[PDB]
Amino acid sequence: CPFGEVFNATKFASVYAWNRKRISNCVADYSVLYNSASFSTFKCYGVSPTKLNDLCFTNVYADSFVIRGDEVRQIAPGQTGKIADYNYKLPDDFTGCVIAWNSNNLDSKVGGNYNYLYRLFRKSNLKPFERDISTEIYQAGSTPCNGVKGFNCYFPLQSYGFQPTYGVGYQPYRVVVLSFELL
């Protein structure tokens, strides 16, 4: 019941600042995510689907963002990289699920969608589940930066630029990550 708004949102958030949308104490139906024919990568860890019916409506979380096609398999536990240790890191003992689907003609502009951003440069690779907003210039060891965009030291974000002329691995995949817990 309460996640018909999480999977149907008109616009998703970017990866560098994603939403931690929390569902609450209603009767949850996990037979509308299971038995969905529309999904492509349904990946649920140690708490199995169709066995979490009689469990865990204990402020379940539901993250949501959008990454490119062959990026969606950087989201498993472990799996270090660039959009999994700067942007969205989930722990090595991850419990619940990760659901992601192919937005072919819902997020791709023929000129290029240039407002889906992912972080590029960040010291001290990111802790689990921690969200950033702050955009500061990087300071990679050189002369002390103060808003410069010069040699070797520049902006930390970078747009995606989706197009319908891409292959499979570049057209955007919206990712919804579920996670369960107890008291």
Epitope: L33, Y34, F42, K43, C44, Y45, G46, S48, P49, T50, K51, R68, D70, E71, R73, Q74, A76, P77, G78, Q79, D92, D93, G169
Partner: antibody, heavy 131, light 109 residues
Framework: QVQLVESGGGVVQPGRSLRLSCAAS????????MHWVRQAPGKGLEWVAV????????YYGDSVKGRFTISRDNSKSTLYLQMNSLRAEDTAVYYC????????????????????????WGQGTTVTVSS | VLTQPPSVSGAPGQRVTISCTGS?????????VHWYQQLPGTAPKLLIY???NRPSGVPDRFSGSKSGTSASLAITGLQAEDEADYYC???????????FGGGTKLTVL
């Protein structure tokens, strides 16, 4: 830090066998599915065996099927590869490589017919079958 | 297996492609191909997984692709360090094995 140290080096007869010991420390060993992958000297790598986080799902390579076996012990957190009828073409150096934690398929069917790669690799202990 | 060119070479600072051709029962069926850089004398290190992704430690030069039945570890601006072997690894469904490639031989000039 993580590593995959290993032991069980071999100078043995064509038809007899030995049992490897691929140890592990540092990472969560009880959740992820190790692989065994060999390299005969002169050529490139070749995949040998796989086993899951418990010991249920196991596949093999076509040169090594039915003869070899692979087992896990979560009391000493190691791997073993037993190689009965070690005939002549089965010589290599044997690497044990960490797989992934994967389990999926929304019908309850826990399985791994997977896509991912082998992240951290062993040191390799050379086995030698010689007439 | 997955066929691979036995020997390709290139001067420092160029862009050298490394092909990896497969059938329809493997990489062409929808399974991804990875890339390992095995220096002669050690264990192969994971370079690309899932056709585009680079872990922490591998630099920004190693770009991979996958289209049709192929792959390309495009090394751009190669230095005097990366002259090792490169193996592409799919997982086929005809024999359910995690099949590797024959192995290329890249040396700088």
């Amino acid at each position: 830090q993580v590593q995959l140290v290993e032991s069980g080096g071999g100078v043995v007869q064509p038809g007899r066998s030995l049992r490897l010991s691929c140890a592990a420390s540092g990472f969560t060993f009880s959740s992820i599915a190790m692989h065994w992958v060999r390299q005969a000297p002169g050529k490139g790598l070749e995949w040998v065996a796989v086993m899951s986080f418990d010991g249920s799902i196991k596949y093999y390579g076509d040169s090594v099927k039915g003869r070899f076996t692979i087992s896990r012990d979560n009391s000493k957190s190691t791997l073993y590869l037993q190689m009965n009828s070690l005939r002549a073409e089965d010589t290599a150096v044997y690497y044990c490589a960490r797989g992934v934690q994967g389990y999926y398929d929304r019908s309850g069917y826990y399985n791994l017919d997977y896509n991912y790669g082998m992240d951290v690799w062993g040191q390799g202990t050379t086995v030698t079958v010689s007439s | 297996v997955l066929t691979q060119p036995p020997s390709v070479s290139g001067a420092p600072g160029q862009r050298v492609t490394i092909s990896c051709t497969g059938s329809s029962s493997n990489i062409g069926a929808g399974y991804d191909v990875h890339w390992y850089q095995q220096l002669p004398g050690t264990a192969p290190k994971l370079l690309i997984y899932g056709n585009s992704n680079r872990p922490s430690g591998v630099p920004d030069r190693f770009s991979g692709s996958k289209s049709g039945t192929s792959a390309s570890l495009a090394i751009t601006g190669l230095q005097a360090e990366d002259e090792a072997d490169y193996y592409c690894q799919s997982y086929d469904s005809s024999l359910s094995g995690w099949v590797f490639g024959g192995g290329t031989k890249l040396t700088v000039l």
